[PDB]
């Protein structure tokens, strides 16, 4: 009847790939919890399996597009948010100054991803900056998607 849009859904098709460790196309308690702590948390398997069991179709410990769509789509269905931008920024930078240096970005990137090099990160960061300072700033992220 109604599902996420090209932009929303898009981030979803991509998420399922970033969430999991290898990109099985589904999120589990092992993957969910992993990323959770990868940022700055420390939940138990109970909250991971419980939360997933409440959204998982078959309740086997992993979510699928069909059950995830209606869940995230029914609760969410809009572009980025001021909270997400700032929040994500608080978790990226170790000092929360707003500037994400490759050291930090690569750290989180490889944490959720597989393996990232100093060149790839600096290449992705420097190429991201507007004026190029070696790191990424809030104004950079916003300008990156929106702003001018």
């Amino acid at each position: 009847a109604d599902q996420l849009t090209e932009e929303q859904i898009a981030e979803f098709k991509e998420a399922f790939s970033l969430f999991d460790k290898d990109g099985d196309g589904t999120i589990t308690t092992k993957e969910l919890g992993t990323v959770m702590r990868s940022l700055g948390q420390n939940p138990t398997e109970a909250e991971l399996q419980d939360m997933i069991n409440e959204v998982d179709a078959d309740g086997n410990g992993t979510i699928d597009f069909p059950e995830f769509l209606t869940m995230m789509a029914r609760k969410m269905k809009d572009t980025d948010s001021e909270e997400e931008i700032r929040e994500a920024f608080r978790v990226f930078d170790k000092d929360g100054n707003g500037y994400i240096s490759a050291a930090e970005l690569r750290h989180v990137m490889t944490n959720l991803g597989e393996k990232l090099t100093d060149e790839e990160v600096d290449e992705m960061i420097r190429e991201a900056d507007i004026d190029g300072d070696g790191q990424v700033n809030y104004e950079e992220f916003v300008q990156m998607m929106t702003a001018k």
Binding site: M76, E84, E87, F89, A128
Partner: peptide, 28 residues
């Protein structure tokens, strides 16, 4: 659009907000 290749961090924070919101609670 200051530079090229922005979709990256975009999906990055999106995953951060959706994972933190989904995993825990409180939509948006």
């Amino acid at each position: 659009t200051p530079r090229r290749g922005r979709g990256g961090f975009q999906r990055i924070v999106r995953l951060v907000g959706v994972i933190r919101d989904w995993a825990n609670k409180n939509f948006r």
